[PDB]
Design a protein around this nucleic acid. Structure first.
Lengths: 67, 55, 75, 19, 142, 112, 144, 100, 141, 185
RNA sequence: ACGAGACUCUGGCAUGCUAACUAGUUACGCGACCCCGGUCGGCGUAACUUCUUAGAGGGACAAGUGGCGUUCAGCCACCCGAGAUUGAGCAAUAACAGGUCUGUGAUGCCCUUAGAUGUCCGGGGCUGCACGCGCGCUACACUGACUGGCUCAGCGUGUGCCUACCCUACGCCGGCAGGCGCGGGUAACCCGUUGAACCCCAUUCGUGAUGGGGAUCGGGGAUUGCAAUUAUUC
């Protein structure tokens, strides 16, 4: 039931492209990072984006990623 | 006389007195909160009155 | 077809059976006493308020839906 | 008001007016 | 000395009930009547569980008033069940050690999570074309 | 008619600031082209051009009724970006529905 | 006591009606056409009649007080609002009516409505639903 | 002097903007004003069959109309309310004021 | 020291039934033999002296909540309007059978009237409700 | 009394599960011993959550059935209580043992599926679910149009199932469901 | 890019926040009754906002760990947790000879219009009954029916334009239905602490078309209306 849509994944893969240095494994920081480094009109969408950021951050620290 | 039998049926009650304030038909009227409005007309002016479909 | 005709008041033999053989059981319920001894369910309840005040049964659980009695204790 | 209509019906008599 | 007022609400439906904990003896009452003669009488042992599990030693310097409103019968049994449980956790938190607080919390979790944590379940809304929420009227064919 | 005392009422009229985006302003604009006698293709593309020149996100001009013949056709004219569903439609898409009397039928004009 | 007494009455015949006395007097009275479960109570209430007792134990002289309370409501103190034929059309008396009497009062309703030729009456002859029901869908097994 | 601003709006944020201006205006004259009370919101409910005729699947609308009521108790002379409440009107709210 | 609330309520109605068996200064009405208690009942009550069962029970509804007049004591004495073949609904009691209780209990100073209507409970009545509550508290040992 | 939890008054310990196979899915002896059958709920949120229900509550739930009884758990908590009276007042054993020995002997070891219909040996949970159904069926059936009450029939079935008499309705079905399954394997 | 999702509304949650004589609380005082010490929706004014109410926010994201999987998308069980799948509203392109001319003073065309298809007035009709189907209600009982006693809701609604017609506490007459005098409420201010039923507690009932079932039909008592027969309803 929980598959991220392209809107979340594009926002994720561009935030980690640009603001990589601020990000890390911890969700609750890079939840609140998104409040400064984007204009997101939804709280539910902010958490979706920041959630898949942390999922990609554990991937990027292990090896290279497709996108 | 004529005028003494032209409207000499009591209109004090019943669905045949009260009517839609747009149509002047006597079916599917919203008497609730004195809209006094046929359900087809209420739907036409649901937005304008202040009613809204959120739920 | 098959019409069970139970006793509303006790036949002499059936009260001689009820005042002898009922406390010899391990259960005394007013539906088993009615079913077995060919007596009535309401009548089998009325029998066990009298045999309560004789001290020959044992009141374990009493509810409107279901009252249960048993034999007098061994000791 | 002399008739003194309810706040339920205040927003309905005024809503109908706007329409 | 001053008061030791500790007011805790408990819900298992629209039924809410507020257990008030103070210094005193073990006189635990619910709208005035104690926990023996609150009908319905079938679920007696549900209200005795915070007394059965923890004993009267924890209900020594605690006198409980439970005001109950909303919901039904079996909801209100679980509404008051939760209040007198969490109030004993709450009264044994604010004024005393936290080690005996955690001790007394742990015993009630390992019985039932219901004693502390409420269930969020309420009546799912009816939808048109059916009697209830997830049921439709009989469909005709042929 | 509305049972108001004298002097309580005062009516005023301001011009619509950037009037291209008001749908019932563009619905009436289309309503009198077809009732004036401009061609239905010519009229609606004229409205559709004017409100992209107004710097909008999108638009949708549906004309339904007797178009050149007895049978009822639909002529939907869509360009730019249009949302349909959700909450945002309540404050992103100005929707007009109007009528017009051509001499053979009623054409329904839907500016969006 | 709870044992089968002497002079126990199994099969009774109270006002030309066969009654099994094994039933309770509360509901053994009802067998007669015109006394119901409701009327049977207040008759037994008008005298000190222990109503846990069945209709076999009861006294051979006690049954005559039971009938007289039914036959005279007004004199034995049963009100106006508790009778089955209140304000009769012909003789105009307030009587509780029993077995073949209730056949006779409900006969005079039919024969009246026949002779007067009333729309209510015409349907009783035609064999129809008369209290203004719908017959389009209901009353099938009654007529073929 | 028991003056009572009955604020009854159809909207929510227009009622928040009004009741915020009826506090930020009241404070600098140094009169003790009670916080804006929230009275339980009254939702109207008209379920219509969507269809002009009665043919199709029996579907219904659920036309809500939420209404919000507030009160603001004032410890002030009867004149000061005529000065503040006239300033910065907006048509969502019905700003009614009781004397006693 | 106990009150009626510390006592089992279901058996307590009989403790105040026996109190008004022993007094016998209520003046019970005459329709009490022939009556149906509410419009939604089928049969007459089992108990020969049902009036003493409820005239008891009325005061211990007036004890718990003060100012329950005629209309209030027809709600708390409400049941099922079992409408035969149509769906069953809620029905109230009877105005006659509840008022002639409230008139019977006003004489022996147990109930009392108050401003803004409704039968409250007199200072004296709270005693003769609690003195029998102490008797049930002794009966349960 | 936090040393032992008296199910109304009944012993939780000294209840032996004889069948090693049903040993996990019949769960009242440890961490399931609650004083009433009636718990809050939440045994239909997930798949095998139904397995971790106190088995008298499962038996209490399977009673409130055939329409009129649905959602009358207070009414049928009492039924199973008044049935455990009848078991101890006959057997002399703790009725929770007589329940468990019924549930082991009520649920069938195989049922005939349709892949003529094929034979397959069933899940241990399938037995428990079909055990509680088949002895709440006979208890409901025998008590219908009968002077004999529910708890007399509910406690006839629970005793006769543990006996293995084939007098209980539950045992005839178990013995015949396997009779069908043996025919078509 | 549209639709999906996101979105808006709703269910859950904050012993943090901002708050309340139209919402309560624990108090404090006083008053009754109970044998030093309780109950109380009986009466009122210091601290409050847990309960209630509705404001801004806060939180939940497969975020955690372990299996599974190109090690991706994910999925699975568990951990912590108020929530680990609350529901609804909205709703694409392309359409259908779908339904509505009987919702409209939306309307094209035909038909009509003093011998009316307009119109309004009394009666009848839509209900009619050998019959066939559809949606339903009530049931076939003892997991029950009856009679007492008991103990708990939440949506809502309510004196209106023309338009009379509002919900109604309380007090007497009366078996019921009601009838009649007194006051509140345009409403978190009055009904109302909506004493809702199932259920719970104790009686009576006993396998019997039985106290199951209430179809059927006679008799009278009322109400609403200008009027009820083809029983308006009770």
């Amino acid at each position: 039931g929980r598959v991220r849509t392209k809107t979340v994944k594009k926002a994720a893969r561009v935030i980690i492209e640009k603001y990589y240095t601020r990000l890390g494994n911890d969700f609750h920081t890079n939840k609140r990072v998104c409040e400064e480094i984007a204009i997101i009109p939804s709280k539910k969408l902010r958490n979706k984006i920041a959630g898949y950021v942390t999922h990609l951050m554990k991937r990027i620290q292990r090896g290279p990623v497709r996108g | 006389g004529h005028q003494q039998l032209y409207w000499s049926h009591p209109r004090k009650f019943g669905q045949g007195s009260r009517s839609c304030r747009v149509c002047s038909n006597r079916h599917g009227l919203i008497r609730k909160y004195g809209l006094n409005m046929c359900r087809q007309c209420f739907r036409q002016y649901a937005k304008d009155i202040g009613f809204i479909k959120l739920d | 077809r098959d019409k069970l005709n139970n006793l509303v008041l006790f036949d002499k033999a059936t009260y001689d059976k009820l005042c002898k053989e009922v406390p010899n059981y391990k259960l005394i319920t007013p539906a088993v006493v009615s079913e077995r001894l060919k007596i009535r369910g309401s009548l089998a309840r009325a029998a066990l308020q009298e045999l309560l005040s004789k001290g020959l049964i044992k009141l374990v659980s009493k509810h409107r839906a279901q009252v249960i009695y048993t034999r007098n204790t061994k000791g | 008001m002399a008739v003194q209509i309810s706040k339920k019906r205040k927003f309905v008599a005024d809503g109908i007016f706007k329409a | 000395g001053p008061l030791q007022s500790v007011q805790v609400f408990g819900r298992k439906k629209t039924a809410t009930a507020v257990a008030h904990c103070k210094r005193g003896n073990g006189l635990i009452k619910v709208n005035g009547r104690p926990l023996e003669m609150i009908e319905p009488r079938t679920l007696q042992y549900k209200l005795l569980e915070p007394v059965l599990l923890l004993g009267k030693e924890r209900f020594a310097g605690v006198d409980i008033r439970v005001r109950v409103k909303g919901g039904g019968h079996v909801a209100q049994i679980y509404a008051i069940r939760q209040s007198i449980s969490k109030a004993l956790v709450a009264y044994y938190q604010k004024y005393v050690d936290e080690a005996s607080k955690k001790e007394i919390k742990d015993i009630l979790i390992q019985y039932d999570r219901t004693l502390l944590v409420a269930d969020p379940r309420r009546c799912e809304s009816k939808k048109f074309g059916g009697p209830g929420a997830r049921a439709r009227y009989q469909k005709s064919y042929r | 008619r509305f049972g108001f005392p004298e002097g309580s009422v005062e009516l005023y009229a301001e011009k619509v600031a950037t009037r291209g985006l008001c749908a019932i302003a563009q619905a009436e604009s289309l309503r009198y082209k077809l009732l004036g006698g401009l061609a239905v293709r010519r009229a609606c593309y004229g409205v559709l051009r004017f409100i992209m020149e107004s710097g909008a996100k999108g638009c949708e001009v549906v004309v339904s009724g007797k178009l050149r013949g007895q049978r009822a056709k639909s002529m939907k004219f869509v360009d730019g970006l249009m949302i349909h569903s959700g909450d945002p439609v309540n404050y992103y898409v100005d929707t007009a529905v109007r009528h017009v009397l051509l001499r053979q039928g009623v054409l329904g004009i839907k500016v969006k | 006591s709870l044992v089968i007494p002497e002079k126990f009455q199994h099969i009774l015949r109270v006002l030309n009606t066969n009654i099994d006395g094994r039933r309770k007097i509360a509901f053994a009275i009802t067998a007669i056409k015109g006394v119901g479960r409701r009327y049977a109570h207040v008759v037994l209430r008008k005298a000190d009649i222990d109503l846990t007792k069945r209709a076999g134990e009861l006294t051979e002289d006690e049954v005559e007080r039971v009938i007289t309370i039914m036959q005279n409501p007004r004199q034995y103190k049963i009100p106006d609002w508790f009778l089955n034929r209140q304000k009769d059309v012909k003789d105009g008396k307030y009587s509780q009516v029993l077995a073949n009497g209730l056949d006779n009062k409900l006969r005079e309703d039919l024969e009246r409505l026949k002779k007067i030729r009333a729309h209510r009456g015409l349907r009783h002859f035609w064999g129809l639903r008369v209290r203004g029901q719908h017959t389009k869908t209901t009353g099938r097994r009654g007529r073929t | 002097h028991r003056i009572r601003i009955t604020l009854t709006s159809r909207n929510v944020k227009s009622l928040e903007k009004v009741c915020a201006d009826l506090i930020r205006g009241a404070k600098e004259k140094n009169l003790k004003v009670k916080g804006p009370v929230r009275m339980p919101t009254k939702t109207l409910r008209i379920t219509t069959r969507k269809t002009p005729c009665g043919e199709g699947s029996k579907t219904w609308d659920r036309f809500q109309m939420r209404i919000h009521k507030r009160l603001i108790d004032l410890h002030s002379p009867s004149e000061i309310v005529k000065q503040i409440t006239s300033i910065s009107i907006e048509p969502g709210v019905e700003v009614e004021v009781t004397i006693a | 020291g106990v009150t009626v609330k510390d006592v089992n309520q279901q058996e307590f109605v009989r403790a105040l039934a026996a109190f008004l068996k022993k007094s016998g200064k209520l003046k019970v009405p005459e329709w009490v033999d022939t009556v149906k208690l509410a419009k939604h009942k089928e049969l007459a009550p089992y108990d020969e002296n049902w009036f003493y069962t409820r005239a008891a029970s009325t005061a211990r509804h007036l004890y718990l909540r003060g100012g329950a007049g005629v209309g209030s004591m027809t709600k708390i004495y409400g049941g099922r309007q079992r409408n035969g073949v149509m769906p069953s609904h809620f029905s109230r009691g009877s105005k006659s059978v509840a008022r002639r209780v409230l008139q019977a209990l006003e004489g022996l100073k147990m109930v009392e009237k108050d401003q803004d209507w409704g039968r409250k409970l007199t200072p004296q009545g709270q005693r003769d409700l609690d003195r029998i509550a102490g008797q049930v508290a002794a009966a349960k040992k | 009394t936090p040393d032992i939890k008296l199910f109304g008054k009944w012993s939780t310990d000294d209840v032996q599960i004889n069948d090693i196979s049903l040993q996990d899915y019949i769960a009242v002896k440890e961490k399931y011993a609650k004083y009433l059958p009636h718990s809050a709920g939440r045994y239909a949120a997930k798949r095998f959550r139904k397995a971790q229900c106190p088995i008298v509550e499962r038996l209490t739930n399977s009673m409130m059935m055939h329409g009129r009884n649905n959602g009358k758990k207070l009414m049928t908590v009492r039924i199973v209580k008044h049935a455990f009276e009848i078991i101890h007042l006959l057997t002399g054993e703790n009725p929770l043992q007589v329940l468990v020995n019924a549930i082991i002997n009520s649920g069938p070891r195989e049922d005939s599926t349709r892949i003529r219909r094929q034979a397959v040996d069933v899940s241990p949970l399938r037995r428990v679910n079909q055990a509680i159904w088949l002895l709440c069926t006979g208890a409901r059936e025998a008590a219908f149009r009968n002077i004999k009450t529910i708890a007399e029939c509910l406690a006839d079935e629970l005793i006769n199932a543990a006996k293995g008499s084939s007098n209980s309705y539950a045992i005839k079905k178990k013995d015949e469901l396997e009779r069908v399954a043996k025919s078509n394997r």
